[PDB]
Amino acid sequence: SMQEEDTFRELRIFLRNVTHRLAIDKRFRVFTKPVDPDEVPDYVTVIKQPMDLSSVISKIDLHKYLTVKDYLRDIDLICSNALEYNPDRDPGDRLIRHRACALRDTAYAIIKEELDEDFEQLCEEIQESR
Numbered sequence: 001s002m003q004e005e006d007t008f009r010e011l012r013i014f015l016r017n018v019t020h021r022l023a024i025d026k027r028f029r030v031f032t033k034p035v036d037p038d039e040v041p042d043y044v045t046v047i048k049q050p051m052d053l054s055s056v057i058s059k060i061d062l063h064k065y066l067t068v069k070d071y072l073r074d075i076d077l078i079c080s081n082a083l084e085y086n087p088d089r090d091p092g093d094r095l096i097r098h099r100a101c102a103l104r105d106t107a108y109a110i111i112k113e114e115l116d117e118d119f120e121q122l123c124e125e126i127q128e129s130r
């Protein structure tokens, strides 16, 4: 329906705004663009599902997220990819893990404070009904 389309449009607007807020945070700059396969030729071979905030924006715009849950699965990937690719005790790896996982945590915290659970519930019900 029209109303269902309106619902998904509001979802997109909400997700773009959350994503923008993460993207403008200085700590998160390394996650704003895909890893360049110049600097990092092994990345694309170790990490099977690369994810970054610019890809998140593309996916929003292509209508790939129909619920906040599906968006958070991609946010989770940003964290878990960093944990997996940068597991070492050295400070360079520790800083990327800290920042990737602070991204996760910040996205969760914004959503906990600002997403209405009945709005999420509606998105899930429309998605399921397809």
Ligand SMILES: CNC(=O)[C@H](CCCCNC(C)=O)NC(C)=O
Pocket (backbone or CB within 6 Å): 030, 035, 039, 040, 041, 042, 081, 082, 085, 086, 092, 096
């Ligand atoms: C081939 N490896 C490199 O180029 C690495 C840098 C990779 C950092 C990993 N990025 C992410 C976003 O997880 N080297 C140096 C200098 O840290």
Ligand SMILES: [Cl-]
Pocket (backbone or CB within 6 Å): none
């Ligand atoms: Cl830095």
